[PDB]
Symmetry: C5
């Protein structure tokens, strides 16, 4: 059976990110049909609970790319697909147009490992989030240029150490997670963040804009997906006028 | 009730900018439904008056990106979202397609502070708008390249002094406001202007095109949002044939 | 009140260019409904005759960007908006989707004045169009890179003298008008041409491609709007099957 | 009747290329409505037979840009427009969305003339197509960068001689026609090919990719339009389920 | 009846790749119409079995570009078109919007041939897939810059040898097929992969990102099409809620 804490903290897990706009004729449906949408959403999540985990987020009003985001994990990529196929059959899903959908895999540390960069690795492992419960999500797709990948392992390691040094301080108020996507999407990475403090988040990304690694980005957003963390019930009720 | 002056003049405020096109079938609604739209807009703005302020602008006819613009402020990012969610549930909102939606935060001065640049700071602080009441809004999203951000604080200060020296004169007939967006949108900044004098505004932007800072812009518009300042009542009536 | 000759020949005039596609369901309306459209167009133009002038052009079949173009002038930018708001309320307008809308202002000569460049200015001043009445319009939005604007006044003057030298001969065959748009649209200029001779026009633009100024263009079309000059009556009848 | 052979083989002729998608609701129309489409197409082509010639091609299934292509020639650009206006008012036309529409003019040889390049000109003039009747069409819009146009006539001639030398051999199985578009569309040229042998065509374009001229292309496709040559009757019946 | 193994393993075969989104109103159709779709799909595949082969893949939930992919082969390009024209006439086809459609031809080895690169060719020739049956498909369109094509045959061979050396090891768990598209689509190549191991596939693409060839890519995806391999019956049933 699928265990949430394990799926969120181990290598080899597929993360499937999808954003949707609600079609204009959804709100033209009868109120009873929309009232029932929330229970249909919970049933489809529950149907797939032995294979996948699902998180929901409200993006309407915080960007033009979408109205909501789904983050789905499984050790089986096709299982994420099957969940999303069934989601699209729900009442809300049927009235949802997909606007972005990126997949990636979690991996062991390539750079800031105990073996390769022990001091920074220690700071990474010892950090503790100490703020209020996160309220916001940010997803940033990232793609690096050919020049980056053609640099040596040693050159890249140095640039990732420079990425890490000024950002460790933000682990008190930003949670991060990295997925790897080269060959599976038009991105090298999907980056995922949770925070209560968007002022801090803006400062964190400014810090990263200022390092030489940033000279290699050909995608660093587009979209930058900003949303609020919501339960599935609240999300679907909100989008259904319920 | 949220204090408008405080929200417009203090540092940690979220600005939420959204532009919409009105769908073709809105004007096919019965006249009674369109007549009721202005009061619905007033009620939703009223509902959220404890947490947000709202400004409306008519962009139809002055660009192809949108028909209207909303600028929403709050100290709580999610409160701006909640207002926009409720806006979208109004009759006009139901028939509105979002075309752009950018958010940012207000900050203390990074460069032209009393400490760092006292003469320019004094000129900035003492400037007074003296023209007739503004009639037009311009919103310009801005994003700077990695080379900009990788420059030193001193190198960047010098370029911002050069931005400021030739433009202080325009504070007699252009009002300006800066928001910071890196990590929250696909922009580093949202810039907001009010004026009665678009000839002056064109000259102002030409002056800024001519300085070295401009060599670093990867976004400087796209869209350049141009509109007229309108009350919410007049905006909604105009778009409703009322 | 508005005077066509004054508005077309003086500095400080706003030019508002807008292109539209006619939605497919317009032609599904009964002929009697479409028959009324032409009179409505003339009435809205007449309603605004004290503040604006209006020209109409048919673009269907000469590009994929639009079916028609409106060029509207006024000394008040908001008056151009008011006209287009009312245009959108007409039968044809309500079935029109805007595809591009750019505004700009007419200005005194910056470069090829008698003061700064007397020989070329004499050629500009003495040229006379001497072909048949123009049949075609071309609108070309232009934007120049930061490197252009960062060049000195003298460097830019030389490049504009090189723009002018090989093109003066085409004033026999082509009428031109320049508008300035930096800060008001995602363009530095809107350029407007009338001609009966598209062979000559092609040769003219080839001559401009060959000069060093052209190395600074980041927009030089996109869209290149090509149309035929038509009365408002003929335009609306044509798009209405009448 | 217009002289087809003359329009296809002389300078100063306008070529008008347009591609369209058939709307999803076309095939929902009653069969009797669709059955009438083919004769309507024939009638509009006949109506304009004094001023224009028309060729039809099926692109559905060979690219995502369009379902069909029209190639229209006339010595009067406005006459090509008039035909396309009337085409759009036909049953199939009313259910067609234009996706690309580019115009250009045929010209005398600029480079590989008897004057400038007599050996290659002789090769060009004496070449004969000798393969199976063409079955396929390819249209490739081309635009060259400012650096190309800024090169001297002599520099450009050399590069075009290098274009021509390795491609003359393909005149046995590829028919070519060049149109000039600068100023009339977002392209410098429209290039048109007919062949039965797409393997040969692929090899021809690879040969051209390999020459220094290709370093100057900023458009070389986008779209690359690939279709099959069809009669108007077969084209319309195919797209109408008849 | 076309010979599938021959079409999949010989030079001179046309590959036609198309992706589609299912329109929102498909699921609004009565159940009986959707239940009939799978047989209609099998009938059209059977109708064309003398000339083409067809493979089907489910892409919904693994990217935002499409809901399904068709890969069609024939020695006659027009036969692939004829199949796709009849596909679009089926119930599912009629409710499908094409999102990408690229064609190409299979060719003999240009670089890693026995004559040009015998050691690497031997490794290519001896390599055997030995993992579990593939479950996933990846399609990556590739286009190389003018600088690549302008390099000599020897220079390009060296870069393709470097492509091949680190990737031979993946032939145990990734199946590959190359098609050539210059002149036939806005791509130089279409690349096609089958695997059960997306972790391996990500590592494979990372290896290729790191070589100098990658500095020449102007397209390497866009879209990167990720799907699951499915029978036609299962594909159509899944998209029909059956
Ligand atoms: C919140 C504080 C942050 C910390 C402490 C941090 C730390 C790290 C570390 C340690 C790695 C290396 C992983 C490995 O060895 O495989 C890494 C990789 C990465 N980080 Fe961050 N990061 C943070 C925020 C961000 C943000 C905000 C973004 C994007 C905007 C980002 C984008 C990435 C990317 C794309 C990689 C992969 C780099 C590569 O493999 O080339 N990080 N980060
Ligand atoms: C109206 C007269 C103008 C004046 C006096 C002016 C002045 C300034 C000043 C003093 C700052 C520095 C803020 C700080 O220290 O943090 C600044 C920043 C900025 N201004 Fe302006 N400005 C004007 C117009 C404009 C216009 C028209 C634009 C856009 C077209 C613009 C875009 C910006 C941007 C993007 C920043 C942030 C720069 C950075 O942090 O890298 N400004 N401006
Ligand atoms: C028809 C013959 C043409 C002549 C004689 C001509 C002449 C001129 C002159 C004298 C100026 C300088 C105006 C000033 O001093 O402020 C100018 C500016 C300009 N022209 Fe033309 N022009 C012609 C055609 C065109 C065409 C076809 C285009 C675009 C394709 C074009 C684009 C522009 C632009 C963008 C400017 C503004 C340049 C700047 O301020 O940096 N012109 N032209
Ligand atoms: C089929 C064999 C081909 C031959 C023999 C051939 C030959 C030529 C010749 C002789 C010219 C010069 C015309 C002049 O002097 O004005 C020319 C121009 C041109 N050709 Fe081709 N060509 C062939 C195929 C192609 C293809 C496949 C393309 C596009 C992919 C192409 C694109 C062009 C363009 C854009 C020009 C105009 C160049 C300029 O004026 O700068 N040609 N070709
Ligand atoms: C799975 C292991 C892989 C192996 C062993 C491999 C091997 C090869 C070989 C031997 C060639 C030369 C074909 C010839 O001589 O004509 C080739 C060409 C090519 N491969 Fe791969 N490849 C693999 C994976 C990939 C992947 C994953 C991609 C794309 C992301 C890719 C893209 C290409 C392209 C575009 C070409 C044509 C290059 C050109 O002609 O310039 N390959 N590959």
């Amino acid at each position: 059976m699928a265990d949430r804490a394990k799926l969120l903290t181990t290598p080899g897990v597929f993360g499937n990110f999808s954003t949707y706009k609600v079609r204009a004729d959804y709100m033209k449906l009868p109120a009873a049909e929309r009232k029932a949408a929330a229970a249909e959403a919970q049933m489809v999540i529950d149907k797939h609970k032995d294979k996948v985990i699902v998180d929901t987020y409200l993006t309407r009003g915080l960007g033009a790319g979408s109205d909501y985001l789904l983050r789905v994990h499984s050790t089986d990529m096709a299982a994420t697909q099957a969940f999303l196929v069934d989601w699209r059959a729900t009442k809300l899903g049927m009235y949802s147009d997909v606007t972005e959908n990126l997949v990636g895999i979690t991996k062991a540390l390539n750079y800031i490992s105990k073996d390769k960069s022990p001091d920074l690795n220690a700071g990474l492992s010892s950090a503790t989030y100490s703020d209020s419960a996160p309220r916001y999500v940010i997803v940033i797709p990232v793609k690096k240029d050919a020049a980056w990948w053609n640099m040596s392992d040693e050159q890249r390691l140095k640039e990732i150490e420079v990425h890490t040094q000024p950002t460790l301080q933000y682990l008190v108020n930003v949670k991060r997670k990295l997925y790897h996507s080269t060959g599976l999407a038009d991105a090298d990475f999907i980056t995922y963040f949770e925070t209560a403090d968007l002022a801090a988040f803006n400062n964190l990304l400014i810090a990263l804009a200022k390092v030489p690694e940033n000279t290699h980005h050909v995608r660093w957003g587009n979209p930058t997906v900003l949303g609020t963390i919501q339960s599935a019930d609240v999300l679907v009720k909100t989008l259904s006028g319920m």
